[model samples]
Every structure is written in structure tokens, then in C-alpha cells.
Target: ALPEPNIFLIFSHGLQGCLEAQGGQVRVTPACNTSLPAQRWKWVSRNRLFNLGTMQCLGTGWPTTASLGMYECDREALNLRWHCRTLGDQLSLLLGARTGQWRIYGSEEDLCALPYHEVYTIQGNSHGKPCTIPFKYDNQWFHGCTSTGREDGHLWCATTQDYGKDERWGFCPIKSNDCETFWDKDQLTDSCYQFNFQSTLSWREAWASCEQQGADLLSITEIHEQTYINGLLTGYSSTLWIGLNDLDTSGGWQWSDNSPLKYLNWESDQPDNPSEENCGVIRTESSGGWQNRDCSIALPYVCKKKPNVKVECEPSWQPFQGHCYRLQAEKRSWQESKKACLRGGGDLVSIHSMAELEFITKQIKQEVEELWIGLNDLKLQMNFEWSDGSLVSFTHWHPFEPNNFRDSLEDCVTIWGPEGRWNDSPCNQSLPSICKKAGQLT
Candidate 1:
């Protein structure tokens, strides 16, 4: 059917225009001599027109077709033109490529009616070879071409908006509500840190384990309301462990860090003091609020550890109370002993309180060694100093020992007597030593 108007350009103009409306006109020159049917071209504006079915146009016309020659023409008067160069062909020309001389044709009546003084015809069929251009998006570079017809090949530009050639989609930046229904595994940021519980532990022991991991049993502050927390729990379950207890009585429920419990999420009639059931835990009821449960009850426990906090000194040691100590090793010199501990990223011993000394002594008895401690008066006679150099005023000297210079002129301190009491002796003496260091006690 007349080549099905293969040489035409499709123009998507405003809604007011018809399908075959006259779009524009073009002038002809000595080098341009062609024509298009009136129904085959559309006038888009004063200077732009599109062919009926394809991307081509006519440059000029007289008997409207054969009498036309290459000369200047108006783009608005004649909707049809002999312009058949495709977008790819125009891009090829921009890239300095060789192609056949294109002839333009247009209508005379429409040209005379238009406001513009100059007009040129556009082509639609001559889709030339594309030139390669590198495009970048999302930190990656992709090779694109100014051509069309290939699978992903389109003569379009890249854009952040969704209309262009390479519009991508995925975890896109959206408003907070856009992801309200989306889920990543079972992760929820609103309730990311859930309160878990493991019960049957005395408040003191529970606190110790939590401190080892640089965390504590969960505590519900005002920031965590029932409405907010209920959203995090999918199934209906009550009773979660908390970091509160009155282990030693006096009705004082304190946190593991010894900080005052500012906000309490206690349910009705909790902390019953039911014969030593003084610790607190959280529970989610059908009613929505939380209740505190006894610590002695057997249940799952919740322990919290903060990011990047020093939890434990490797798996070889344990944290008791707030201090960290080691059992006495068989035997080593003060310097060698120090180096051994240094290998473990520690230093010689330093005891502060009577409770700490008692704990270390208990550990030493486990190893069955009268070990040397990190206490010594090496710098000044009788002016005792710990390896970490705090004045050694808090000492547990054996009743009749610390006899500074008995027979061998003792200068170092040893915790070897009953209950591993302190004893001052010579540094050169070959005795087992206990290496201790300071760690994160909070």
C-alpha cells in the first residue's frame, strides 16, 4: 500500500492536535527535491513537523510533488516533508559520519501562514549507525550508543526520572511510609533491640554474666512504651527478663551498671518479695502492657552488650564481680611473668579492694600455688606500689609477715600465706607469680 508510508516520523504533540494534522513546513534548495502526501505529514509547530507513519518528511513541493526543487521553505505551512533521516542518522551526522544528501519538501499555503521566517525539514527513515558514548550511573560506567533497534538500545538520555532508557529500580530511596509493608528477613528498626529473658539466676550472678558481655538484663525506659513494643512482638507472649533486682534486700532494684533505674515498666502488683523473688522481668499481656516477674523462675534471659565494648578478656578468663584476676601460674620471674601476661595483652597484678583480694585468693587456691603477686616496693623501701602504681594502702598482710627484710632481704610482695595473704620478699626469689590486669569492669 505505497510502501506503508515507511518513511514517516511519529510526533507526540499536544492533545488538541489530530492524527494527520499539518505540523509544519520546510523550504527547498538546489540540493533538496522531494515531497510527502498531505495526509502523511503533521505540522507540530511553526518549525517542526512529523511524517504520518514513519520519522521521514518532505522538503519542498509545487504540483506539490514533482515541481519541487532544493530551496528555502517554511516549516509550518506544509505538514508533510521529504525528511526521512531517523534520530540515529541525526546523531551519526553529529558524530561526523558520511551519509546520502537528504532532500526536504513542504507545503506552500501553511508556510505562508506560519510566523517563523526560516524552516527546515526533519527526516525519519535514514537511521544511520550509532556512535559509542560512555554513560555513568550509580558508581558504574556503561557503554551506550546514540542509536535504536537493539534490545536495550534506544536513542534516549539517562535520567534520575523514570522515563529515560536505563531507568533502574530496587531498594530505592523512598519516604518512610513507602517501606511500611516491606520487610528484610525479620528485621524491624523500631523494635530492633528486643527484650529476651533467661531466668533462674540469682540477681548477682545474672548481673555478673551480663557484665562479662558488657551488657545487662533488659531495662525498659520511657522511650519503650507498650504501644511501641507491642508492634515488635508478632506472637502473643508475656514475661520478658529485665535488668532489675534487689538481691541483697533493702528493696533496692538497681541496674548492673550501678546506675539508678530511672524509668520502670512494671505491671500491677510486681516485685512481690515472694520469699526472695525480688528481681524484675517484663511480660507482654493480652492487655498490651508489661509486667515484672521474679528472677528465680526458670525462663529465657535477656542480656545486653553494647557495640565495641570490652566484654571479656578472651575465652580463657572470666569476670567476677567487677574485677578480673588470674590463678597463680607455676613459676616465672617478674619480667618474664610480665611478658607472659603481655602476650595475652595484660600486665602484672593490681588489687584494689578487700573483696578483689579475696576473689584473687580464691582463684589461686584453685591452682594450688603460693604465687607471687604484682605488688612490690622496688622504687622505695617499704613504700609498696602495685604494678599499675597506686599506693598499696589497701593491703591484707599476713598477721606475722611482710617482715620487710627477714633473712634474704625481701623487696617484692607475695600473696601466698593463708587465704593468700600478702608477704614481702626478694624479687630474685624463684616463686610462682600471679599476673593480673585492669579490664572493663562496668
Candidate 2:
């Protein structure tokens, strides 16, 4: 048996007759019967002929019988024609045979200017066939097909070419009309009015350095701003260097604007001008406020403004008797240790005296559990004053210490052990101490 023909057509007669004449009765007839008659007919096949209503054979060369159903009813024939035409139109659109939204921006005189002539290839199945053409326009590439039809004032078009199988084409919105938001840490000004311990020159030098790096010494005007900057501070219970200072005044402190110090002051009897100290510095208090100090007396200084500023430690601790210390020693509570040091006339050991620290470390063989030092200012409380009235201006705190008495009160202080270990306890725990003598301990 031969395989069925890949394609075929339907035929029917009118009510009156056979292939010879009359047309009244509708009946199915073989093509051979009227093969040579050529009364009226059409062709149907793959290429151009695939789209038509009715079809016929040329002559009797091929076998034909009345059994063949070539003449299908006119209604059915018309329907088939309509279907074929629709398919053809759709296929042309999918193949970019017609211009769609993808080509809307094209110049009026371009080859694709004709709207109706546009052709596209509609995807019928998974069979690998040419689907669309790659298009470039508006500074980006798009894969699309031209459409024979238009809707919503525009034609459907593809932006991606790789469709079918693993790769598929899709519509990509224009990227030109996109927007978003961003955060800049460096641009965030420091609201914290930190204290700078260095002299006016030192402060000026520090300020210049900050400006060089696109930053300014911290300038805090409002309390709310202060609160915000405070959150950014690493070590609390300590004074950070703001742009404020009183290099000209003794106890009469002022900010960079020469604005009178409006905030709280040190506990009475503070800012007790050391003979060599005339310039002023500020420190944080247990109450989270500010207190002015003599610039000559060293205490941990905070240089603030905006970030991105570069600064080096003061050339010498001579003016401040400054030294570094830690808060939150992982071992003891800062609050307890601070109290102990206060009682000893030395808040946890102030590190003004490098020799004293070295000596103390040797005496204890640096073996004892690290002990709290007397260097905390309680956020500048007591203005970071040591037992001998010297300021705890300079410092080298252990990693992440004096965290501004954060997480817990533990506002006391501690020092690094020989093995670089940190231990904490009440200041009065009677552990070997690191003391700083203004000139030389009497």
C-alpha cells in the first residue's frame, strides 16, 4: 500500500448533474472524470498554491474515478481558504516579515516603511526554524519580527532573538527610563561635637588635613545632630575630637565659631588650668555630655567631621600626658572598675607615663589577669583627669575598648596584659598600675 498523500483537496457536485454538465445536486466526484474538461478549478500545494479555496487536476494522464472526493462543498472550501490565508499572515509576522514595535523608530524612508508589507514568522512548533531577525536601535540591540497586523496603535514585537529550546525571546523594556536611590557614608556629616586635645596649631593642622581629604573638622550645632553622630562613635565614655576647641581661652571655652560653650561643663573645680595648659579640649561625661579641658593635658582626642578624613596621632603626649586604654575588657564591667579607680584618686590607670606602664608591667611580670586602668573620662567624666590632676588625653586602648561605655555601664577601664590579653575588675582591685606623672612623680 502506498503512503497517503501528504496533501489533498475535497470536491462536490451541484444538485443537477455528473462531470458532463448540469449543476443541481451536490455530489463528490473523482478528478479524472473532469480532468481534461477544465470547466473551472484551482491548484493546491506547498509553496504558493497552499492558500486557495478549491483545486483541480490538469488532465487524464493520471488515473481518476468517481470515488475521488475532489469537489468539496463551497462553504467548506471557503473556510479552508480563510484558514490558510490567516496562517500565512501570522507566519510572516513572526518572521519579522512585518515591522512591529521593534521597528517603530525607523526612518520614514527606510525599507521597512511599508506597514502592510511587513512580514513576520509566527512560531508554530519547537522545530528549529528561523523565528525573527536581530534588530539594533535606540542604542541597544533587539530581536524581533515584523507584524502584518497592528493593535493598540502598535505591533507586537520581540526584543530577544533566542526563542525556542533553551533560549527564548522576550520583550525588554527600555532601560533609559530607570531610577534608584543611594546612600553615601562619607557624605554624612558628623553631628558629634567631639574634642580635639592638640594645640590650636595642632587643631588647625588636623582640620587642614581633614579638608585635604574632602572632609572638615566635625561641627555640631544641634543636640539632635550630636545624638546622630554619637551613634557613629566607636568608643563611648570618651571624648572625640570635634572641630571645637579654645586655644585662646583658659576656662572660657569656645567652638570653632568662637561660640560660647553652651552645653554642660566639667564637674565644678574642673578645667583646673595646668600652668602649661591654656588652650582647651572637651571630653564626654558619664551623662553623655561635654566638658572642656586644657589642651596641654593629654586625653584621648576625637577628630571628627565627615568621614574620609586622614589624621595621625599627635606628635607627642607631652601636652596631654595622653595614653590609650580600653573599655569593655571582656573580663570585667567598666562601671565597677571605674568606681574602684575613682576611689584610688586614679580612674582606671591613666597611661600618661609610658615609663610607669613599662615598670608596672615588669613588676607584675605582666602575668596577673589584666587589671582596669585609671584612664577613662567616663565619656570625659571627671574630664579624663588622673590621680595627680593630669589629663587622660592621649591613649592606646586595646582593640574595641572604651566603646563609650556601650552595651553596659561597665564604664571603668583596663589595660593589656603581657600576652596582650585584657582583664577587667574594680579599679581598687589593687593590681599593679600604669601611672602618668605630669613631669616626674615627686
Candidate 3:
């Protein structure tokens, strides 16, 4: 990127003019300047464009018109918001272990509208700080960073078990980068893709590169995958070597993966170069259209294959809303069910919303009339908490039901009857239960 991230021409008048913040109006003025007050706009804060001269936000708030103008600094205002668009193919982040940074694989300044990936820097300083094992958090001692109670989902640990007193902590550092950090996973197909922008490999060399990694050059098998690949290619190389080619086919196309060209990926005038251009290249102009190019032409490439390590449920488990859940047919006490759930990657199911609660209830409506849930007030009388430490955003409770029915020792929770209302139950009572976990490469 240039010294200034937002020092580009608007072409408001077909490159004949530039943005001017004079008279508090963001109008186009003649020509470009490498350095000028009105011409400069800084990302003073996220999504808010600040004019260098006016020191105000460029916005189109309230009753607006075609013209854009400057306004008071309001990053939260919808009028002052802007989106950073991805360009060309895609640029992948490269982690620098020695420097604790992640650089872009192959970002050339002019080729990228914004090359943050190339020169992007991590935003925090706690990454290198060593974590204190067995740190105390919310009455639980964790040997490592815990995802529980973290709204942002980043793994973190307390510097001291008394962090509630000292208020010191840090976000965990990433394990490693290598090529593993570069693979983009497709959950739908359980496959991963690697776009190597740093390499300038010929068609055959590119094919060899993919095979060495137990993958094939990029292949578009479905229209949905085609659109996804296009989005992934935003801000990438103009010509990317793909798996398709006419080298073996007399007149048709074939993927190196051996999948037929079931979907058309060519531009309207693609494959026009005939025998000379036998290799397929994703011409950036077409937003992912394949064009025949000389096999000898060196270019960046994409690789696709199943992940070496996958974390899907084995047989009996089911997938729902970014989590993997399983049913324990062997009935057990509520505490035992919680213990069994912990044996897996999750705790007893904590229903955050009515939809999931109703879904679980309806699904098990036929056989299991009783099921233990993770909600409990074991510590306090009525202060409920989910075992997973998630927020109690929503709950379904029968009116006047959790009254310790007959004043029994009801501390655990359960969904009962046909109404899908959760009721308090004795912790010692036995019932079927559910567990959930989020998985990834491993």
C-alpha cells in the first residue's frame, strides 16, 4: 500500500478530477495530487472516512442527495460508514514467526487497492506474553486459554488467578503458520484450498505442486463453488493456473482431478487461442472466468483437496448451527449426563434460544420424554447458569413451574411434556442428554 491508505483518485470526472473537501462539501476538483489537504482522506477510525483538511467525516446522512459532504465525526453514523472492498483475486495472509506478523503472500502495491494483507500488522501487544497456567476465571481454574465467557471467541487466559483483582491478561498467540495457516476450508465439502500467489509456476509445474500436497489444481465442480472461488480470488493474481485444460481432450475439457467440465467456466470468447494456449487460467477481469493460455506462461495457482485432519461427528453425531451434537441413549443422572457430555468435546446441551430448544424437544418427542439440560442453579437458589458459560439470552420456562415442584431439591433442568417448556429437576434423577462441540482441521 502507499504511504496513505486512501490517497487514490475518485475519477469523479473520468480521472480528470479529484476529491476536494472545500466549503465542507466533498466535490470533485481538477486533476490528481500526490500530496494535498483536501485530496487526502484518512481512516481516522474504522469505517469512517475523515477528510484531512476539514477533520470531519465524509457522509451522506439524513435526507441525502447524489452529492456527498463532510459531517461531524460519527463513526457509528450509517452515513459516515464505508466498506473496504476486496479486489482482483484473493490475497492470503502470511504469518511471520520471527517478527510476530502475518504478511501477504504476493501483494504488489499497484495490483492491490489496499494491501493490508501484505503489510498488515497485528493490533495487540499481549500475544508474546506467557500465560499463567491454572488461572482462575469465573470460579473455574483453567490450565490453558478457555473459550468460555469470551464473547469475541478468541482464546485467552488470565495472567493471574486473581485477575479479577489485578485485571491483567492476554490473548493467546497462534500455534504456528507454515502452509497450514494458508489453507481456506470449505465446510460444505470438507475440502481445503490453497492459493499460492508467491509462486510463479508454469502450468505443469503448478499441477505438480498441487499433487505433491495431495491436492489437485483448482477445479470448479458446482456453480455455488464457482461463486465462492470468485469471492476468494478477490484481490489476487490476474492469471491463476487451474486444473482444467484441453491437452488430453481432442475437443472437450477435463480437470486434473478427473472431474468432467460439468459447469461452464469460460468467458464468452475464451479458449480462442486454440492449440497454443492449452492451459487454463483464471483471468481476473472476468471475475473468475477461465481463459486458455500458453502452458509455458508462468502464473500463481490454486490447489484443492480434502483436509488431512477433519473434526466431524462419527456416525451417531449430528450437526447443527456451527456445532456438533450427539445423543447419549444410556440414561443417567443429570450430573452423570453432564460428566458424559464433558467426556466428549462439550458439556450437557445449553439451549440459548427457543428455536434450538424446540428443535431438540420436537426431534425427541417420539421416544425420549425426559432429557437433562445443562441449565442449573447449583450454587445459588434461582440464579441459572449454563454449564458452557454462555449468556442466558433467551429461555423457555413454564409459568410458575420451577417452584421446586413440591419443594423438592430441584437444582438441575429439563425439557418436559409437549409444550417444550423447561422445568427444574432433581440433580440425582436419570434422563437422556445431549452434547455439543465445535470442530476444525483436527
Candidate 4:
């Protein structure tokens, strides 16, 4: 499979200006907004930078030390070729192959030295000082430099941190559905319906397309649902694919989501199997409803998405294995911490597997000296259990732990520091807690 496209913004780290195209020339400007055609770019094959706005490629106006500009795409031209090297901390440097030097648009001294193949720190947006390059002269680091002869000079320099006024850029994956438009609506059955009529594909092809969008081919479980979907049709008469099929076992129909066939609105004398028809279709005729048709036939289809309860946590909450977790920044008593987690729509996190135990342990070691989870035996000594009332199926206790060092006072559990092993401690003692809850989906 082809690699997914990477989308990002290119802004001047020093000038707070984004790379933009003006008068056929590529330059940095503060007005370069994301999603705008002039500011959007893609790295095509042969290291060519294609501008989305002009449908052109970026290349040097003159072969030697000339400024870059938008010109007709020339994949084989050396001037259009560039290389991108990722410096640690989410920073990258662009180098022009023809010039054999990093691209720079800052001070005149650096720009003048470009023709001589001068080496300079490839500065731009950054987060922290990466370890790959050496720190020597004052200008060795990626610095957001001031713009020459410009009032907003300070905005032009690249910095590792976002100072509210500094220019910045980030990346996101480009998806197939990002350019496609489809119609959607909420149904009476707490489900969403998406209709696509722009293209017609075979039943199997339609199924795969819907699956890519996190949905399934329309499955009608009620008469109202069938009627609701029929109303979405635009033309007078047409045929659309539904999820019903007997491909696995002839005469035994099933919905794409594996829903049992509880209701049927078949037309009179329908499902006549003459040419080994196995797929289902909704015909729009006076007596049309549901009919078995050949699965290879291409037709527009509807997709259904059942509503599900999505779980999500607040900011700074870390996610793992279908749950969201938050490590407390403040210390509190075991009982008080449980109550606080309840207020946030969750409980003290419960680990059910060794992988989970190890993962949480690693996270805590990086953030705090010690923390509390949901494990405890507060009600009965030697009867360990989770705060959520789950049976204790896994344990990562410290050697000879739960000794009840102070008789019965050490009933609460604490993930010890340095090693992250469990130990029974007094419930009244203060320690940071970890909260867990379900995640949310849009």
C-alpha cells in the first residue's frame, strides 16, 4: 500500500511568518494562514515541493544562489529537488540539492553566504535543544531571528517554545475522506445514516468503502428505517444496495453488522433466485421494497452507524487500552482521593493485567515519587480487592509486602516509589492518586 500523505505548516521560526507564494515568488509572511491554497504544500516524488494553490512546483529562479519561486512542475529538474532531515524534538530542516546547503531566508549575511556553500544552523520552529547537533557559536542553535527592516522582526525567529506570539507549525495525516463529501443524519433509532450517490460500486466494494468510514452498509431492522432511507432518494425510481445477504449460505440472509433479520418488507413474489442472486437491494417501484440481486452489480449504497456511548477524560489525561487515566498532582488521603475521582465521573484506576500494571508503573515513575491506584483491602485484612469491586486476578506486590507492619492500620494499597511495587499502607496517609474513566468518540 502507498504511504499516507503528511500535511504540515511551514512558517518562519524567527519572523513568525509562514511560507507563502506571492507574485510567483515563495517567501515568508505573517499572513500565511493554514488551509489557504497559497500556504498549503505537498512533497511529491523526486523531492519536488508542489504548491496547492498554483498547482506548480517550488524551484530556484536562477540555478546558482537565486531565490525560490513557483514554476511549472519539473520532476527531473535539480533546482526543484530538496531534502528534509528530521532534527529531534519534532523539528526538521530543508536542504536544496542544487545549492548543497540548507535553505535560509533570515539575515543578509547568511543569505549572501548561500552561494559559497556556507554551513549554518538550520533554524526553524522547535521544542527543545535536540542532541544531534553540537552547541558552539551563539548562532548554532535554532533561533527565531528578527526580520531585517521589518516592524514585526521579532515574530520571524524560530524558537523551541510557543510564546503566544511566536510562529509555529505542526503535522497531521491526510485521509482519503478529507476530500470527499457525503450526506449524514441522525435516525430515530439513535443511529447515524450516511448516503453517497456520487459513485456506484459493487456490493462488496460498497461494503469495503463503508467500513473505511467506520460504518456498515445500511441494515434495515424496522419499517420506519426502510421508509426513512427511501425518502433520501432523489430521482423518481432507482435501486440501492442494503446490507442483507445470503452469500455465506444461500437462502439464509443476514445483515452486514450481524444483526438478526427480525423484520422484512419484501415486495410481492420477491427474492426470485434465478441467476444465483445473493445480495439485497431496495427497489423504488410501486410494489418494490426488498429484493435479492446479483452481488456483482454496481449501485449507490447507504451506510449506517449505530450510536455508542463514548468515553473521554479531561486535559492531561493519558489513554491506554480503552481507558483514560490522570495522575494526581496533589496528595490526598485514600478515601478522599476516591471521592474526588467519583466527582470527575470515574474511580481510582483498577489494573487487571500485568501489562497494565507495568505501564502505569512506568508512567508514575516519570511523574511522581509515589502514587495510589485502586487496589486496597480496607474492609477486611488479607482480602485484597479493587476499588471497582473487581476480583484480584493480578498482583505486583513488593517482596514480603502487606505485612500489616502496624497491625491493621496498613489496609490501603500504594504503588511504592523507585520500583513501583505494591504495598499496603495506612489509608489515612496522603499520597497522589490515579484516576481512570472511559474515552469519548465524536
Candidate 5:
């Protein structure tokens, strides 16, 4: 956790938003921006939802509805610990508050991602319409919704959390038309267009307005593009300034982003008055054709930019800090696991901090009781080093660890015990391993 990492708990279920931590509770909000600490969560513990901004973990009430929020984290309460599992092993995961009674794995409406789907179910007024996050369907638990297996690629939610001996499912509601803002998205152009018909600006001022928002004056470069621009200009009639300009050198037109002017829709007999007409505009009077105009003239303008696209980490590997970790459940000797990790462009994990140790431990606690890590003193006696060549400044060894078997050599180390402790073991011990690699994007 050296670099520190925070992420949005993207709830792809009900509203398809994120869990935003609020003052006394949480709510599902659209992830328009994630710069706020309250809107982001750092998984300090495998079972706790810790918010970096509030310096608190998610707290909840038991079998009754009282109201949930981020309380003073020091409240010595196990109710704050929520055991989490991926629903149907799908994108939507489930969290059950781990405090009382045979609380989990039941077909009851007790499935809680806490705060009742982030507080939506806090009132328990969901009217018993049971779609238990991972309600068992066909004896196999589907974490949340079925993302695949539908030839038409539609999502289906079950009527019962436990689909035992029952067979009934309905397609999830199709999403509405999605437009983040006034900017109109055009996938064909790989950009969004925002027309400023109400506010007019000079050619130079128009470019500045677009630049303020990380966009540029419209640089429409494709043929058959006028058919779409004119469509957007149906109710309004105005000559809008485009990005094309020759202000630097008259007659030498260039775009704001310096893009090549591959296609032009200039009006007939245009670009004639070349005294000070160094800017380009789309004249609505002539099929939205381009027209040369003075750079100082005020006119409505259009701005466009490429949509921001995120490259996520590979599906199987979990990203933390700056590195990606993958838990290998297969038992193998230290050397064999090391070789296996090496073959996949990684090495056995080298724990760097307590949080890192907790994450690594929780991952394997579900798979095996003991596992091999990258720490070893194989080359030289008592000089423990990480197999990945990272500096070793932190260690969590049991009281009797590193004895080197008292008389014999126990060079390799395996992570064991309940409290993230380490044990010196023989190098040939076959145990599962965790691998570390640079984050790979799909």
C-alpha cells in the first residue's frame, strides 16, 4: 500500500451507480466524478469498507433498521465487519454485515451490501421482491445478475435469492438514453459535440471556452458529417464558428488541434474576401457549409473532444497500490511456484506493508491455510531477501520463526497463522503462492 489506492464501489445493480459515503449514511450516486474521498473507498481490511476522506469504516445496524453510516472507526464493534463475496461471481458483489445469527447464506432478504444496497434497503421496505444479490439459481450461485449466457446479451435477475427447485427469471430493465451532460456523444466520430447556440463568442474567445474544459473548437473532419450537424441545428439557425482558421498566415488554414483538413464542406464561392477573414464558420444558409469570417466576429460556436476511456486491469488479477496480485491456489514447491510466476511475467509476492499483508492473507485464507511468499534466505544464511528484489524493511514473524529449523537450514518462508504471521519452512514444501506483476490492462 505504498502508493495508496482507492476505488469506486461500482454498483452495477439497481441504479447502476456507485456507493457514495455520506455524513450519516451512504447512497447510490452517478459516478460523474470521483475526486472526492467520500466517494472513494480504500479496502483497508478484506471485510471492512474504509473511506480515506472520512478516516472511518462503514458501520451498520443488525437485524433491524436503525440507519447506517461511517461511525468513529474506533467503535469496538464486529458489526462493522461485512463479509463480502462476488454475487454469482459477476461484476456486482454482495456484502453481509458479520455480527449476529445464522445471518448469511440464507434465502431470506438478508442479503445486504450494507446500507441496504448502499442504504436503499435500510428501511427493509423492499416489499419482499426477492432478488437476493446472489440468490442461488440452479444450485449454482450467480453473484448478481447474469452477464452472459443470454445469446442476446441481456441481463436477467432471479425472482428468488435461492432458486432451489424454482425456475423463474426476468430481464433487467434496459438502460435509458445516457448523456452525461449537454454534450452529445457521437460514437461514429469518437467524440462528443457541444453546441453553444445561446452564448455567442468571438473566434479567439470560443477556443478559450473550449480549452477551459479540456476540449477544442469543433474539428469536424469527416465527409457525410453535415447530415448530422444540420440535424442538431433543426430549431436554431445560426452560423457557428468551427476550429478551421488561418489567423497565423492568411490562406493557410489550420485546425485548433492541428488535425488534417481531410474533408471540407465550404459554401460555393466561399473564402473569397481574404483581407481579414482568417476564421472558419458553418453557414446555416447554405446547407451548413463552411464560410471564411473575421476572427474577431462574435458568433455561436461548437466544441468537441474525444470521450475519456478507462483501461481497467486484467479480470483475474486484483489491483492494489501500483501492482497487480493474483492468488495461485495450486500447491507447489517454492521453486516451482516461483518458476510458475516467472513464466507469467511476475514473481512470488513480496509483502511490503501491513495492509499489503492483510490483503494477501485474506485472499489466501479462503483458499489455503498456508502459502509460500517471495521472502527467502536461500542464497546466504539468515540474509532474508524478497524474490522480487524489493527492499525488506517490514517483517511479521511468529516468535519461533527464522530459527532456521534450530540446526538445519529452513531458507524459504510461508505465510501462516491467523494474524498474518510468517513461518520459516523448507524450500520444498508444496504450498499455494501469491504472484505480483505490473498492472495489465485489458
Candidate 6:
């Protein structure tokens, strides 16, 4: 599918200026107004950047040392085609689509060679050329080959003293206000709520946007809460900006609300600071894993806030073992109880440990009372399982209890009274239910 066309104001991180078109030439200038037509650009297919005001497109005249300018939109024009190479945290390097060259700012000599050795250093030419050049870092700036014999020796280079932030780029939408905000109940905190912005914004802009809404960027503290949030982004593909940042002091990550970094879900080999990646993002791909990013890159974000009124658990709910559990005051069939638990942002209790089983058993008022504990063998008569689909490791069943007695009528499991042993019964049978959810502090 073709990429959705969105208006944007392209800002150069190296020069700290907006890209503007004047006299058919594209250049960066601090005086460029965001509202001006000259600054508004739309990225069409194949990296064709269209100027909304002048109805022109950006193109280059030379291979590497060419300046950008406005020209007639042409699908066949290779000079007008540009693509971006993401450098984490939303910062990216614009490159020529056909020439495999980058749009850079620097001396012609430096631009000829790759600025950073990690990515720019080429071992040898494709025609079996000699590879004897030694790679070195000057600490202040990266330098390329000085000899014309090397393939990139004659290429131009753009070098800046600022390592992380200088060579990046930032973009903001110009025509449409696509920002969307919606609230989600906190799985752990009863009164706390989260708002998701379903649109793109820079890290600093997102932080300010949340502040304006009387909240801050979402700060996660626990594993279960992170898991709960991950469930929300099951099908989403883009990374989400979170409340963590290290702008104040490099490597010292902290939440926007001054919260400590207590829990982390970083992807493998993540937080690889390619360049000036000081902000944090939650990836939907790795089940909501985290990685450090550049602050100027634009992305969707979530905000968190607490209701003005004090939050509390529902009536009859009791706090225990990092979760809230409630013995139903009313009776429900197995299917009905599962639906009820889901409506309350929970599921039927699934005991994982002996201590948890005993703790739940003690909550029963009567010694010989039966209650639903989210266990069942409904799929296969003999294969018992928990409602959450977790592996059944800790079982507390009565002797020969789940024998599928009465010809498969007994598929749902429940806690039999007095001894707290499990027994399979008809799923349609009404019984007291137990619902489990993360505690307020989780």
C-alpha cells in the first residue's frame, strides 16, 4: 500500500532551521514560519517531497555536492527522489533515492567520505581494490579518507562537534491536526488513568502536550502494568514515546514526573545510542520493549493522570499478594463469570503457587463452600487448564476429581468446600466466583 500523505514542516537538526523554498531553491532558515506555504511539505511515494504552497518538488542538480531546489513534480526524476535512514529517536539522514547518496551539509572533501567509521568505513572497492587504510577516531569529530585513491576519498563530508543532536532532523505536521487522545483505565491503580495520543509529535512537544492536559507522559513502574499496556498495542506497529529521558545527564534515565527507573523492558541490544538518542520509546514489536531514542524525533505517546477523587477498589474486593481478589456476592456460571471478570478489567483468579492457593482459600467464609477459580477443561475433557491460558503447574485437586464424570458434563473446575480441593463440574452450574486484578500499587 502507498504511504499515507501527511503535511509536515521539515526541520534540520544540524542547522536548527526549517527547510524553506525561495526562488526555487531549498535551504534552511530560522526565519521560516511554520504556517507559511513555503515550509509545508508532503512526502509522496518513492520519497518525492512536494511543496504544498508552490506546488513544486525538491530535487538536486549534482551527484553529491548539489544544493536542493524546487522543480516540477516528475515521477521519472531521480534527482527529486529522497529517502530517509532512521538514526533512532526519530532522527534520520535524508538520502538520494537513485544515487544511494546522502543529503548532507559539510565541506566537499569531508562529504566524499563517511563521517562515522562504524557505518561509513568501507573496506575495499567492489572491483577487488586494496584495503590497507587504518580507521581512527579524532574524538572531537569523525574524518574520512584523505587520499583520492579510495572510493569515498573524493566525496563530501558534513562534520559537527555535537555528537547526538546535531546531525538529526525533526518534522511536524502542518495541514492536519491528527492528534487524538483517549483514556484507558489503569490496571493497577484504581483511580489512575492513561491517555493515548494517536498522532505523531516530537518528544518535547509530546511532553508539553501532556502537561497542557494536566498529565505527563506515561511512566511505567511494574511488570504487570507494562504487560497490561502491551495488550493494548497488540496490533500497533509504531513505537510509542514514553515518560523516560536522560536529557539532563547522559545515561541517567528518569521519568518525566521524577519517578525512578524501577522496571525495564528493553529489547536485546537496545539503547544503542547511535547519535544523541536521549529519549525513550516503547516498541510494540517486542511486546512493548523499550529503547533510548532521539528527543527531536516525532512519534505517538501516552499520558497518565489520576482522577481528582480518591480511587478505591469496588465493594467486596479485598487486597492481597499484589492483587485484588473478590469472592462474588452473587453466583454465576463459568462463562458468565469470565465475562463479568473481563468487564471489570480482570479475569477469574488463576492460582500459580501454593501460598497463593492457601491465601485464596483462607478468604472463603464457609469451610465447605464451592467457588469458581478460573480453571476448566472445556476444550478437552481431561486436559484441565486455567482461564488465563497459563500452564497449570500447581494443582490442588480432589482425588479422581476431574475424571470427566457424567459423560463430559464436568468440564469447569471449582474449589470444593472445606478441604479447598479442585473438582470439575458442569460449566453451566452456578457458583460463587473469584475475580483477580492487579493491586492499586502494582
Per-residue accuracy of model 6 over 44-153 as CA lDDT, tens digit each: 43455667666666776644554456776532444765544431112222322111221222221222122211111111211111111111122222122233223632
In model 5, the clashing pairs are: 87-143, 87-144, 88-142, 88-143, 89-143, 115-119, 135-161
Model 3 worst lDDT run, 10 consecutive residues: 88-97
User: lDDT rank, highest first?
Assistant: 5, 3, 6, 4, 1, 2
Error of 2 at 137 (Å): 36
Better of 1 and 5 by lDDT: 5
lDDT of 5 by residue, 178-280 (tens): 3344478776765677787655567887777666456788876555466777877777778888998767542245577765443446665666576778889
Assess candidate 6 and give its lDDT: 0.58
Q: Pick the candidate with the highest TM-score.
A: 4
Residue 150's lDDT within candidate 2 is 31
**Residue-by-residue lDDT tens digits, candidate 4, 247-267:** 763224567776535355666
Whose lDDT is higher: candidate 1's or candidate 2's?
1
Q: Candidate 2 residues 1-442, lDDT tens each? A: 2121222222212211222212321232334233333222222211111211223221111223222122222222322221232332322342232121211111213212222211121122311122233332333322233332335322233323333223432221111111111111323442223232222324444444334323445544445455555555536555534555545322223455332232323334444444444333444453334444444433433333332222222222122223322232234444454454444333445544456456545553346556655544344432233434554434334432333333332234455656332332333344444322223222
Off by over 4 Å in 5: 1-179, 308-442
TM-scores for all candidates?
0.28, 0.24, 0.30, 0.32, 0.30, 0.30
- Candidate 5's displacement at residue 264, Å, is 1.2
lDDT for each candidate structure:
0.43, 0.34, 0.60, 0.57, 0.62, 0.58
Per model, how many backbone clashes are there?
63, 89, 8, 21, 7, 11
lDDT of 6 at 37: 76
Which segments of candidate 4 are over 4 A away from where they belong? 1-181, 309-442
Best-fitting candidate, measured by lDDT?
Answer: 5
lDDT of 2: 0.34
Better of 4 and 6 by TM-score: 4
